[model samples]
Structures are given as C-alpha cells and as structure tokens.
Target: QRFGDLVFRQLAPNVWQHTSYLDMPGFGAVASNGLIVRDGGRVLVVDTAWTDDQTAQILNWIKQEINLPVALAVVTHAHQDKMGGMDALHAAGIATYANALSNQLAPQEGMVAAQHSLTFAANGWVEPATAPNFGPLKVFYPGPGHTSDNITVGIDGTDIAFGGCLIKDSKAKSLGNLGDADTEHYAASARAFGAAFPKASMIVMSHSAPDSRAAITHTARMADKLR
Candidate 1:
C-alpha cells in the first residue's frame, strides 16, 4: 500500500522510516523524514509529511501493513514538515501530542495546534521539562536550538533517536534556517541533547537520512561555528 510520494524504509525490527517531499517558501523542494514505530501491538508515529493527505496515506499504510492502531502521534516542532499531517492524525482518532510552546507557535506560523497538549509526560500542558515516558517511547526537550519548542523522541531498547529539526544531518552544510532559531544557545542545546541520549546509535533529523550519534557532536560543532 502506497500513497502519493511517501516511501518507507525499515530501520529496525520495530521501526520504519518514512520520507516525503515538501516545497518550502525559500528552500524550494525538500524531503522530510518521519518515523513509524510498532511495539507491543501498539503503533506510534513521530512527525509527519507536509500535508494532511500525505499523513493519511501513511496512516492507511500502517493499518494495512502493520495491522495495528496508531495509539499516539508526536509532532517534533511547529514546522509544516513535522506537524503538517496533524489534522489527519486527529481525524483518525489518534492521540496527537505536542509541547505547549509548539502548539502556540504552530498557529502563529500558519499551522494549527495539535490534538493533545503535552508539556511533558509528568506534567501535561505545564512544565519546566522532563523526559516523559509514553509506553516504550521517551520524549525529551534538551533546550532551544532549531526552534524554541523542538523535541526529540527515542524508542526504548532501540538505538534510534528522532531528533526532529534540532539535530542536523552529517551532510548538512549549514544550520539551515535561523528565522526561528536560538543562535546564541543552539550549540549548547545540541550538546545537551547528546548528553541526554549518549547511547543513541542512530539519530534521525527532519530533512535528511539517519546518522550515528556522532552526528550530534558534529552538529554541535557546526552550530557553534554559525554566527
């Protein structure tokens, strides 16, 4: 089962990576990556394509192939590539979760808020910040970098880490856009993420293929070099 330009690649026994293309205002056409996770008969999704249609297609495929209902959908940031499919997720009756800041900033950036407001697992909607455990998933916010509300998700017992847009790919030439970035604290923020998840073997970014944990250090170095 396929939908539009969405494609899937199996990264691990319980993890599949989906890639879809999107046209940004100034970035032209860019490909974004998301995750589909199946654990203990439950499915979890991280991020989404650039549109609701694309998101629906992925959900359809999950039902057809995995034969499990999506229990939760986590949006990494307020960007279109990450949360663009949120409406579809909500329509599908899946619990959609996003940080309070992300929910607030998304509409300001011309997107809608997610279905569920999750500041962290411990305190939903209000938080200083703590790693919230959602079943086998752990959602974390290291600090402000790519965006004030960017977060990362890690699958328990796996080496995978969905770094969202905060960690850049190894091939990334620059930090991408700084329009909503915290340049002053970007490097430190990235380093904090690494400190939080040093055991993550595969770190996934928003717009590129997955790379190793070293990619975090590399991104931190590159982000520090940015003025």
Candidate 2:
C-alpha cells in the first residue's frame, strides 16, 4: 500500500493511475474499476465498483490511501458494472455523477434489454441509483459503439479521457464481441472516437488493461473491419 499521501505516479507526467485494483470474482478479472487523478491535494475518482461488497472494500481502501473522500464518481456508461454501485456510493454521501444519457438510459430497461437478457447480464434487473449531480466534468458521446449512452470524460485541463467500455484495451483481440451492441452503429461509434481524439496520447477504457491513444486507434480500426 502507499506509505502516505505523498505516494503517486505519473502514468504520464501529468496523468496518474492508482497502483491498486479492486477485484470482483463473479465479474471479469478486476471488477468495479476506477481511475484517479491527483490535482495537487484533491483527488477525483472516475468510476466505481459493481457489487456492494466490492464497493465497500474499494471505498475503504481509498479512505486508507487518502484522507479525502472522492469528490466525484463518474459513471461512464449505462451498464450495471459501471453504474450499478453508484447508488451505494451516493448512500455514503459522496457525490456521484454521469452524463445526460446515463440519466436518460439508466431508467429505461428497453435501452439495455438486449444486454440485460444475456447470461452475463447480472444486473438483477435494477436501475442505477440517481446521483446528486451530472457533473462539472465534460461528458462526450463518441458514437453508438458498446452502448448508445456510452460516454468519455475529459477532466478539466487534463489530457486523460476516461472512455468506459466503448474503448477496450488495444491488446484486446476483437471489439469485445459486439453481439450485444447496436449492430448498425457500433462501427460508426468506433470510427468517430478514432477521429475525435487524435490528439489524446492515452485513453483509459473500462475493461482490460489501459491502452494508449494509438492502441485505441487500432481498436477502432478493428471494429471497422468487423462492421
């Protein structure tokens, strides 16, 4: 564990990622994922964990790392893994935030009915807990890949773009098997993100290990190929 608040790393010189990961067994390799940005003293948390047990452990770990509670919990997409635990975080009195689409899609089962129907859909068929704010964070919808409501967060003055599940780790072999995505728009979304963020050097996707902007470019290329 970090010795104190002094502990931090430059994923780049300005960008930083937490040295720790919160693992969720029932889900993927590491569940209820997040990214942190240390701006002088205050830290901003990008996303949160899935289940209640994992969320509690993760929040406790954060409490141990920094005395400051999370200023924001950004829900990058509409899926349960990204938005499900937001309610619990809200209950703890930490401000949770997401884009307008998250506000729109979180309530509509029809938007996510396809993903919710699959065996992997462990949502328990519930909606996300509403948050206190949509955020001062800038949320951009790159396209219709992954999901209609998928968004990328651009922190103020920081080059880091937290693109939830829409941008998979570049090392990933395929476009995360878009059997659940909007067949007509997935490729277009991938293409749009590729074009939109050409200047961003690094991007943190929701799944797998993080990848660079170039790697995301490759991912977008691959998605185009499939489409």
Candidate 3:
C-alpha cells in the first residue's frame, strides 16, 4: 500500500531519483527524470524535468524529504527536456548554473518552450519561476557535441560530472541524435569531457544511471565512431 510521491533509492544517503508519471494530455508524459544529490547542507539538482507540473512534483518530493535548500541547479544541456522546469526552481530561491551561452537561452528557447507546454497542463502549470541566482558561474566549452551549449557540471570537491545530455550513457539505446552535430567537433567535445576530469570517478547523465569513467572512455570511442 505504498503511495504518494514516486521515488527510487540509489548509491547513498542523499542520492535519489524522482520519477514522474504526470500525464499532461497531448504532451506525452513518459516518466521525465531528475537526480537529487545532497552534499553537505546543500542539494544539487540536475536537469529539471520537462514540464512545469512534472518539475513541481519532483522538486516537492525533494523539499519534503530533506531540509537542504537546492544550492545549485545544473542545466547539463540546452535542450528543452533538460531545462524546461527551471523557472519553477528559480522562483523558490534555488540558484542555477549552466554553460556560458546556456543562461541566454534559458529565457529565450527555454522560456518559450515551457510556456507552450503549459498551455496543455494548465492546472499543474506554475509561472513566474525564476532562475536561481549563481555566483560567477563557471562555463566550460567542451568543444562541440550534442549541441553547442552542451556542458558538464563538476562538483567542487569531487570531480563527478553531471554531464548533462552531452555525454549519454554508453549502454544507452543510442548516441544522442547527432542530426545537428558537427562530427569533428562532437568527437572533440567527448574527448574534452573525459580529459577535463582525468580522475573523475562517476558521470551522472540526465537520462540514465550514474556511469563509470569507463563510460566516459566509451563516449570518446563512440565519438570517434560518429566522426
């Protein structure tokens, strides 16, 4: 008779997944995913789920489960699925960090797409969501892959990466659609991610489970295949 918020336990005391089956008619709500990592008294969220309601549900679960404020939010990549619900988190005082060009699109493409999706999930939609304030955000140009804005977030002490959607899980069904990727640069970016953290122990991607440095190595191999 378990009920209420849907969640999954993995890794440790603070790592969890908030999986949502929020059905927003017309918009296909097939389990949007997000990760919660609690470090110290701060909570770091990766890729706010797709729609406003979906995001609200996930964040609410995090709020109820822990007292830590969401200290940082990493967009991972610029795709809408990866960043759509940021406005909701921002409204609650959580600061977000993303690639250099990422912030600009947050208001442009990110805001535009979110509003359109809300048109369907009216009741669950929340507006006026703000982008969490962040101190001089660090932006790394991983050459080019997935998209020009794809970037990875490195935890301060440990080098584990929230690789966003740039680097997909090696065992994933497919490499992120490269229809828009510049082959040479995409391969380069993949190498850059692995190179950036020579000793990175884990890479937490938005779409799948946390992966090993070997996965990062595979991403580079795949990048070469793609090129």
lDDT (Cα atoms) of all candidates against the true structure:
0.81, 0.56, 0.60
The better-scoring model by lDDT among 2 and 3 is: 3
Q: Write the per-residue lDDT of candidate 2 for residues 1-227, one digit (tens) a residue.
A: 22232223456443444323335566544533456655555556666555444455556555665556566666667666666555657667666665555666766632221112111112211123333333334455665677766767665555666767777776777776574577667667765665655556667667555567866667667777765
Clashing pairs in 3: 87-129, 90-130, 91-130, 94-132, 95-132
Report the Cα RMSD per candidate: 3.1, 8.1, 8.6
Residue 108 of model 3: what lDDT? 62
In terms of lDDT, model 3 sits at 0.60
* Minimal lDDT window, size 10, model 2: 112-121
Better of 1 and 3 by TM-score: 1
Question: What lDDT would candidate 1 get against the real structure?
Answer: 0.81
Best by lDDT: 1
Predicted candidate 1 versus true structure: per-residue lDDT over 169-212, tens digit per residue: 77778888888889888998898778777788998878788898
- Which segments of candidate 2 are over 4 A away from where they belong? 1-32, 107-137, 156-158
The digit string of per-residue lDDT tens for model 3 on 155-207 reads 44454655666777778656767765767877677777777666668776665
C-alpha lDDT (0 to 100) for residue 147 of candidate 2 = 75
TM-score of 2: 0.69
